Every structure is written in C-alpha cells, then in structure tokens.
Design a protein around this nucleic acid. Sequence first.
RNA 1: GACCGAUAGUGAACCAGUACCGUGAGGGAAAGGUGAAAAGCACCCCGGAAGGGGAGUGAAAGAGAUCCUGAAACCGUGUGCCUACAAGUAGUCAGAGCCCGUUAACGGGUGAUGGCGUGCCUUUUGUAGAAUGAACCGGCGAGUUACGAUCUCGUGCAAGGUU
RNA 2: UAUCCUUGGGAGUCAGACUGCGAGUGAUAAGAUCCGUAGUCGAAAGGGAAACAGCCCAGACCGCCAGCUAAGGUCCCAAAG
RNA 3: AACAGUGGUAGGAGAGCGUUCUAAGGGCUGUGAAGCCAGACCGGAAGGACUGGUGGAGCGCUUAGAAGUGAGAAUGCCGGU
Lengths: 117, 49, 154, 100, 53, 109, 142
Amino acid sequence: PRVKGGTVTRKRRKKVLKLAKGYFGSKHTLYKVANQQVMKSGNYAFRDRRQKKRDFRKLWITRINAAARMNGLSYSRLMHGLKLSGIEVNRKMLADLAVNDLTAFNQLADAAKAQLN
Amino acid sequence: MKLHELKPSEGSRKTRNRVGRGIGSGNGKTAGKGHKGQNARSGGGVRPG
Amino acid sequence: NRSEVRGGGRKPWRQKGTGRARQGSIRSPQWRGGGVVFGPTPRSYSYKLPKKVRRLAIKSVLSSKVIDNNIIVLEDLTLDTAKTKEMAAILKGLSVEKKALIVTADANEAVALSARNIPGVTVVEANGINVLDVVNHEKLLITKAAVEKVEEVL
Amino acid sequence: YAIIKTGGKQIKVEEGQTVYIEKLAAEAGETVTFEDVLFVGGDNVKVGNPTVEGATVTAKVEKQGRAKKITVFRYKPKKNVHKKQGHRQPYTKVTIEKIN
Amino acid sequence: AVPFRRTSKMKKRLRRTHFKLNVPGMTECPSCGEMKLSHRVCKACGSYNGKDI
Amino acid sequence: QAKAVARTVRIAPRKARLVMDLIRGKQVGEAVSILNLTPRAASPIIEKVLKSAIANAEHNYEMDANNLVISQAFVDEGPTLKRFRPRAMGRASQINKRTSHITIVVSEK
Amino acid sequence: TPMANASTIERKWLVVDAAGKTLGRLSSEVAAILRGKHKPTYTPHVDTGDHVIIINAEKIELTGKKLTDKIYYRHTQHPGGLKSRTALEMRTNYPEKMLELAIKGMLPKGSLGRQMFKKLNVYRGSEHPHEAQKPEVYELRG
RNA sequence: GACCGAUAGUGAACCAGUACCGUGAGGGAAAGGUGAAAAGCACCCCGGAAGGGGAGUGAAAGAGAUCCUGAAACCGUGUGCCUACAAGUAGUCAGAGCCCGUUAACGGGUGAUGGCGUGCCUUUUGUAGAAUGAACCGGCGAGUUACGAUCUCGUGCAAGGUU
RNA sequence: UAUCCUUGGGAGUCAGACUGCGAGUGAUAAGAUCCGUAGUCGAAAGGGAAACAGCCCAGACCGCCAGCUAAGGUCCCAAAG
RNA sequence: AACAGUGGUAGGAGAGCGUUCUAAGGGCUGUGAAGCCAGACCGGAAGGACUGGUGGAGCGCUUAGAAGUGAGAAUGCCGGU
C-alpha cells in the first residue's frame, strides 16, 4: 500500500502559523521562516520567565531605597537592620507598602533604625 | 480467542527501528552511521576479514 | 524501479557550467515521473508452523468453543432437498442467529448447496477444519461422525 | 490589610478578597487558616517578631484548578536538539475572611 | 548589479505611494454642461470660449 | 445596491488599480468625466462597466441614477497568458500577458 | 503584582545652584532624579522624574588640570572633521552644553532617555525664567 | 489482489510514442471530473463584442463549459488599534492606553515605552558568520525486499526437534 | 563510598582547540608546532570578564512577581556603600 | 511513601503519537460523511476533540496485523506565484 500524506503536513504547518500571529509579514505568512522564529520565541520565553524574577527584584529594591532615603536611610543599612530585627517580610511587600502605605514603611524603618543603635 | 480481542504474547513482537525519520527518534540525519567515511555510504564498507 | 521505468539513459545536461544541479537521468526518484527507490515487489507472506503447534491450536480453540457453549452436536443431517429454507429453519430451531460453521465427514452436497447462499454460514468436512473459520463463525455444528473423525485423527 | 506567607512566597491581603495561590489539600469548599502571619496592617499595627502571635487569617476555597498552559520550547540552535513540553501549574482559588 | 535581497511588500508599497495619477484640471462646458479640460475644447459641445468650431 | 463586473479582460491589473484609485468613493457623473478626460488605456473599459452598473441599477432596482455613489471598486488579477520572447543567445524570457477582473458596486448616498 | 505608574504623575520643579560644585558628582544626582529614582513610584518605562533647573553653570568647579587638559572631542561625518574644545573654553563660552553633555552621557539611551533629558533646563547665571512653575530648591546629598 | 488512484499507476486513464526537439539514429511530454438528467440560461437591460446584472431551469447557478471540493504562496478592497526624533535577526518578558467580548478562564486584538536578544541547515577546533544551501508556497522525494548466518525475546516440544 | 569483572548484542570515534603547569623545535617569537599533565569547550546553557567557544564563578526537568550566596561589584548609564 | 536524581552532540536502549490498507466486532452519516476555513478547548510531546461555516458522499472507534508510513533544506524534480 501507498501513503500520500496530504493532510498532516498542512495541518501541522497551519498550527504553527496560527501560533505565529502578529509577526511582521512573512514571519506570520510563511511556514518555515515563522517556525524558526516561533522556536526562537520559545527560547526567549524560557529566558524571560527567569528574568522576571531578576527584574522585579530590582524594581522593588529601587522603590525601597528611595523610600528609605527619604526616611533617612540606605537600602543596605535598612535591610541589615530588618534582618537583625526579624522583619524578614520580603521586598515585594515592602515595595507595595512604600507605594501605598508609606506610614507602615516608616514604622518598619524606624524599628530597624532603632535596632541599628 | 476472538478476532476483536486479539493480543500477542508479550516480548514476541517489537516495533522495527525506522531511521531517517527525525531527530526525536535519535536516528535522524545519519541513521546511526555517524558522519562521513567508508562505512557511512551506500554499499559502504569493506569485506569482513 | 529506475531501471524498469522507460527512458532515462542520457545525462540530461552536462555536469558543469550550468547553474543547475547535477542529474544523471530524468527517471531518478527526485523527478516527477521517476523510478521508485525500494517500494514493494511480488513475494509470499506464507510461513508454516510445526504440526504439534498447529494441532494444539485447533484443539485449544475447540476447547474454548465447548467451554463457552457455542458448540452443538447434531447427528444425521438429512435433507430430502438441497434448499436453504430448510436449513434456515433448522438454524432457527437451534437458535442460531449469527455466523455459524457446519461440519460433516463426507461432504453432504445438499448441505453445501444449501447454507452457502446464507452470508454468515459456512460448511466444511472434518478434514477441512481450520482454526480461523472456527474463531470467526462464532458457533459450531457437528455430526458425531465428524466428531469421531477429528478425535481419532487427534 | 494583612500579610501572609503561604507557598514559599508572600501575599498582601484584604478581607473579602479573592486570591490565587499554590496547590493545597482542600476539597473545593473547605476552609483554611493561615497562621504564618505577620504585619496585620490597615489599622493599629502589629509586626511579626518573625511572626505575630496568633492573628490567623481564615479563608475558604472556591476552586482547585490548573492554570493556562505554556509550551516551553527549547532548542540549541545547531546540534539538532529540541524539547517541547507543556505545563499547567496547579493553583488554588481562595476567598478571605477574618484577618486577626 | 542585482538585488542582494528580495524586496518586501512594505517597501514595495512605500515606493508605489507616489506612483499614482492626479486628476485633470477639470471644468464644465458652459454651452452644453458636461465636463472638460481647462483651456481646451469641449469635445461634445464642440465649443470653446463661447465659440463653436 | 448594484454591481457590475468585467471578467477576463486582457489588461494589466495595476494600471486599472491606478485608474479606479482615482475615483473610489465618488459620484457617478464626475467619475465618468474623470474617465472620459484622463488619458489611459483602462478608462474606456472602466466607464463601460460602470455605465453597465448604473444601467443595472436603474433597470433592475430603480435607484435614481443621479443620486448614486461608487460604494466600492476593485480589481482582481485573473488568469494570465504565458508567452516567450526570444532574447539573445537562444535564451527566452517569460512574458506575462496579464488579465484582470474589474468589479464595481454602486449605491445611493 | 505591584503598581506600575501611568499618567498618575506629579512632576515638581527643582532648582540647583552650582557655585562650587563638581559637575560629575552633581550630574550623577540630577540625572537620577530626572529618571525618578528618588521616588517610590518609580517605573523604568514611564519617566517618573522631576523637572530640574540649574543656575550659575559657569561657576562650576573641577579637579586637577582638567580645564587645560580635559578635551571634548566631536566628529562630524566628514574626513578630518574632528574638532576639540577644552573644558575651559566650554565653561566660558557655553557651560550649558557641557553640563548637558555630562548629564546626557549618564542618562539612559533611547526615546525615554531623550524625553527625560527634555525636562532639563540649564541657565547661566541666576536668572531662572521659570518662575511660573513655582519650583523649589534641592540641596545635594553628596 | 491487506496493488495505484491522475506529480501515483503503463511513457501514455483524455486521438501518445502524439505534440515538440533533432540531419539522423534517437529523445519525449503536458492534459481526467458540469449535472441524476441539458433541463445548457427563452426573454429584458448595459455594452461593438467579450463579459456582466436580472429573470428562468435545477436540490443547488456561490454548478454556467478549467463545469465536484478548492488550501497556500501571490494579488487586492474595507476597517478596529498603532505609527512621521527614530536606528536594532524583527521576537520575548514587563506594561499603560484604546477596541472587543470567549470552547468563560487569573479572556481576546492592538500595542506607546523599558529590559534581554547576532536567523535555520550543513560542515567545522570553532560559524551571527564576510564559509555552504534554500526566492516563496504546494506536492513527490532517501536505509527497503528476497535468501542465508548470528544474537536477543517469545512460543511449542524436549535428549529429541524438524520436514 | 558504590562502582568493578566476565560473556554476549549494538555503535560511533582515530581533523581536535584554548588556558595553566613541565619540556622540546623555534629567536626560551607566534592565537605556531609537537609531547606530558589538569581543566573548559567540543557535546554546556546561566552570571562576570563591555562585546567576546576555550578565562573567573557555576551545571538548566517545569513553573512562581519568595529568599541566601559565589565570581564580580555598589556616583549615573546599571541593583546595591 | 521516603530518599536521590533528571544539560547533552556522535551513538546505544526504551516508551509512545500519527498516516494508508486489511480482518473481526461494534458504530456515524442527506436530520448532512470525508475534505477545507475558523475559533479564547484538552493532553507532558508527537498530537487529539468540540462548536460554527463551506462542501454534498462516504468515514471514524476498539483490538491486532502489514507497510511505497511522517520532510525545511540535495545549486533536489514538477507546477504555480
């Protein structure tokens, strides 16, 4: 018996193309050039899933540092005082406070500032 | 037995190893012949001794 | 094959100078018309087992038929005619609403002329028994004569 | 508003709020108490020494699901390597009550 | 002396922007109404500047 | 509304595209003036099909010819014809005697 | 899931004198605030900074022999179109631009960097045309 | 017929060893499908015609003579969002605004702006590679079969197994 | 601390590169060549070394908007004195 | 359950997905098959469903079996653009 293979190839390639929407022209219109971007998008995505953890950390830290500098402190000195106290909350929480409830941030910073002395 | 409940004795049957049918198989692009050489060619080899 | 296919022969274009690819014939597998690489070729899928095994097989399936009680013994099949109405009436009386196999010893031609126009029914002598017919026909009818024959040759 | 530590992570919470967290042993209508609690917030304040005593946080489940899919695809460019792999991270949907 | 690359649809269209036709400088035929080129003769009126040929 | 089509006419489509990109979305009378006065090969064809359209409207729909507008108007590349020019040195060059399907749709205000 | 600002901004206007200051150590703060790192509501992609005014740019200071030996090179896109200007004559003729150069250099690059540069407004002397914005003074931490 | 089903299968499902190429021997194609049935479009209009729009036939005319379906490349029309101080293998992650509203779930389309990021294959000590190959889309296209040997697994029988 | 030996089936490989150390040839020149030895690459992504196969740190099932560290760093580009 | 582990070229081993055909058994289909187009569905992957549209007559499911069994590249062949 003989086997053509008419539907499978089309179906698979179309699946890829539906994944490749929004890409610039030929990279959504054509199979193979799109494939080699989709794949590349997969590696980029893996990478970025792990860069998020690295980026938001920075952002939180900058926010905390600004708030501590207006409170009269540095980030490093602050977090040292906090770990020395037991206030191991985390940086995301601290940032959310420093934006929304800055009085609580001040409470915590004053605790650490006191326990640095 | 019945034709619509057939099954073999385990270990009697196996699937054959096809090659040149992708890399997920682990036998793509070379069929396990490795890279270039007299053993990698069509009719490629030497007499046994 | 590329040899069996008609034509080919000449190098369609010189090896070099053209921008085109090296090609040796218009009938190699790359081409539209083309010769097939390996493909099929006539052969026989037949093989033979040993005798002990095959007789064990038929014994086994008969044992299974007698187990699940899709077996019927029926002495003295006798038809004044060779008709199918009578046979179907018999099968109805025996509550045989499906495929079926029928066995004799010496080829009751009346029974063979009948019973063939029925789709699901087949007829055979004791010498002509298979495993496949047995399995496939879901239920078995035998004359005790044929029983003695099969059990004495087995 | 309170803070809690649940899944090796932390959450800021207000009462009556809906949250999605890591998987738990609940059964889709049960209740839960978070006790690894700290920073009761919102009012008269209480901060964890590491953790504030008692002051638990009750809640109840509404779903025990598995989130939207992602197809991590990984290929070393040459070398003929691929890994295609799906993932539905389980999760648990919760509604809060009674910060303490 | 040849295209190192194939030209994309986008640049093809960006080139073909200016490749277009302006309309004519059009006027009516005051004699029998229909339109006409400026400073030129109404083919149907057969008239120009209030004068028939 | 109303429609007219000129299917399988030997002319290149881009040229027709130009000529109707002029008039897309205009009153029929001024459009006819455009086509009468512009010096291109495709204007007679296009005014022909347009005139057929307005005729279809007036005859089969009675839609007040003067009160009409080109709702849409487009061209579709139809079946080419293949030819060959004997260039130098025994080489030939493929020639694409193009073909176009002109389509016009007319409505009221 | 924190906040990421957008059109929820209040850009104040700050003023800085430079009577005895080193432009580098000064600029490293003014650029930080032009970027908004002195705020809790910082985001990297929104320009949360704050407008800045600088006065008495001529009256900056330097260390060492920079006025004689520090050289601002600048090339056209013409051959041998290299040009050089010492920090001294830059200070005399136009200190606005040399401050702008330093700060531009230590700002981020891209549209956002340029747009936060656009908040800067440097002025020789002590004139400050931007009275209307009701600015305030910013002393330097350094 | 555990043979093909119009790039397959005879080279050839059709007026093919034809057309066509070659002085010549010789080489050597392409090209199937209306409908159950012509009932194949009376008649009206546009138009010089072609080709259309109506009407009518028909279950169907989006079936109308390349006449079942009819994809993709390619070509265009319209429009929701974005875009004319911006450099970026063209995406990814974060993300505002705007527009929608699903196989109803931490939904969808766009995406200002920020961050990270030198294509695929081959061959190489090593290639983003200024080394090779591919214009693109579609189809076809490469480790098989016979016989024999050997190893493993399985089954049957066993100092006897087998034709 | 668990990998070692035998028998049998199946392979691929026999163009290697740099770095550190010890040697040769060289001009104690070569990103040179040829040897030994250890590592890395090859066949290994990630962080730093601006970028940067072979250097420093360290080894990727997958996810998380959690945390502690290595190398290297903390005035701004760019997180941190 | 506990513990430990899960980078990977050549290459070895094992698990499977899918295509055509056949046998049997059980089914779908003019109240609309296959095929084609959409869709925000499911699965660890190959992949598989559901709904709607087109189309207008054949096709799945289960267990087994046999193969012209899966294409992104050959300055590949043919056709189209």
